[PDB]
């Protein structure tokens with residue numbers, strides 16, 4: 773069954789780090805020969821910036837370069853996103869997408885809202 777489970781809200785402090793827990797799923801009969809591509813988006817419906825791209829890392833916006841890293845193992849169906857050196861501007865929406873093959877790709881429209889404060 774196709775899906776992405778991650779928190780609706782997550783809070784963090786400026787200069788610290790934060791973890792957005794995440795897990796995904798898909799049907800048992802979906803073939804997976806050459807792994808799964810993992811992608812995280814920031815403000816998808818607006819600026820649409822790439823935070824993580826396990827398939828084409830040069831697509832990662834300079835804004836997040838060196839500051840975001842995917843924790844979980846795709847093999848274990850985990851998509852946890854760790855964000856480092858937080859900035860108030862990091863506040864906004866984050867959505868995960870995984871792409872296996874052909875039409876077997878999925879963007880979670882729910883996403884997680886991030887709130888970074890100074891103190």
Ligand SMILES: CCC(=O)N[C@H]1[C@H]([C@H](O)[C@H](O)CO)O[C@@](OCc2ccccc2)(C(=O)O)C[C@@H]1O
Nearest residue numbers: 774798869871874875876877878879880881882
């Ligand atoms: C078999 C699983 C599945 O339904 N995957 C579809 C996904 C999926 O429905 C969404 O990602 C779930 O949120 O949508 C897609 O188009 C997205 C699209 C739809 C309409 C217009 C433009 C683009 C997508 O690539 O995200 C096409 C996929 O085939």
